[PDB]
Amino acid sequence: TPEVGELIEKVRKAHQETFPALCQLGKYTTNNSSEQRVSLDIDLWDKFSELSTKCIIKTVEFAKQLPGFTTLTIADQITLLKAACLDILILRICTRYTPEQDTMTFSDGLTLNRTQMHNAGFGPLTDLVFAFANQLLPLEMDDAETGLLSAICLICGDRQDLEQPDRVDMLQEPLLEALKVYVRKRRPSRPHMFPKMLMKITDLRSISAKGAERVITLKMEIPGSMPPLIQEMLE
Ligand SMILES: CC(C)(C)c1cccc(-c2cc(-c3ccc(C(=O)O)cc3)nn2-c2ccc(S(C)(=O)=O)cc2)c1
């Protein structure tokens, strides 16, 4: 379909322009607590929170390129971004997972193993985030699919305090339709692929809810090392 093809192309381009892929980056490592579990490696947390600020900027750039996002009220654009920020950041870091080395790669090439991701701040959430990354791999998702899943996660009408939830639901409707027809065309062998992918958003919300609780825990324990929160940055 030309209207569907055009929508897929726009979302694939919005994602590619705001997300450097694992293959494109020059991986580098750090010796910082690489083989020792610690409650919090402040040097790892410092690098990690600086990378997060840059990634939140890219997410906002991605959101603004989604057809119709900027037509929503400013209050609703802020509400959607605050609610999906952790979900999108989780999806982005899990997209750069290397299973044999059990590492994830940041947008500047920084490559941390499971112990280091735990020490950088993930703590009790590490195994859940790494399990999600492991579940993504067999889906063999391309840029169009990752972009569309990110857009579906963002443009969600069930978020608390939305001024126009039906409008947001209507904006989400062509994205779901595009992903359905796209996965059908590209993978006709597996017709269960589309609901398997939407199930990942359900998994993402659960992990994101736990993540928000960890943000609060970290704000309590290390307030002086906390960068401005997601809510603070987007406002
Ligand atoms: C457990 C917990 C640690 C809370 C957590 C939970 C879920 C997601 C994150 C998270 C992922 C990224 C990220 C950074 C860079 C890239 C890139 O380079 O591709 C990709 C992703 N950042 N990030 C994050 C969020 C808030 C904050 S905070 C408290 O607001 O300081 C700091 C960091 C973190």
Curated annotation (Swiss-Prot):
Location in chain, cross-link Glycyl lysine isopeptide (Lys-Gly) (interchain with G-Cter in SUMO): K219
Modification Phosphoserine, positions: S39, S189
Outcome following mutation: S189A: No effect on heterodimerization with RARA. On ATRA treatment, localizes to the nucleus, and increased protein levels
Span(s) of short sequence motif 9aaTAD: 228-235
GO biological process: apoptotic cell clearance; cell differentiation; cellular response to estrogen stimulus; cellular response to lipopolysaccharide; cellular response to retinoic acid; chondroblast differentiation; embryonic camera-type eye development; face development
Phenotypic consequence of K219R: In the absence of ATRA, abolishes sumoylation and is mainly nuclear. In the presence of ATRA, some sumoylation, cytoplasmic location, reduced transcriptional activity and no SENP6 binding
Result after altering E235Q: Impairs interaction with ASXL1 and NCOA1
The keyword Nucleus belongs to this UniProt entry's keyword annotation: yes
Residue ranges of the region described as Required for binding corepressor NCOR1: 224-235
Induction: Expression is induced ba retinoic acid. Down-regulated by aging. Induced by pulsatile shear stress.
Entry text on domains: Composed of three domains: a modulating N-terminal domain, a DNA-binding domain and a C-terminal ligand-binding domain.
Description of how the protein assembles with itself and partners: Heterodimer; with RXRA (via C-terminus); association with RXRA is enhanced by pulsatile shear stress. Binds DNA preferentially as a heterodimer. RXRA serves as enhancer to induce RARA binding to RARE. Interacts with RXRG. Interacts with coactivators NCOA3 and NCOA6. Interacts with NCOA7; the interaction requires ligand-binding. Interacts (via the ligand-binding domain) with PRAME; the interaction is ligand (retinoic acid)-dependent. Interacts with AKT1; the interaction phosphorylates RARA and represses transactivation.
Protein name: Retinoic acid receptor alpha
Gene: RARA
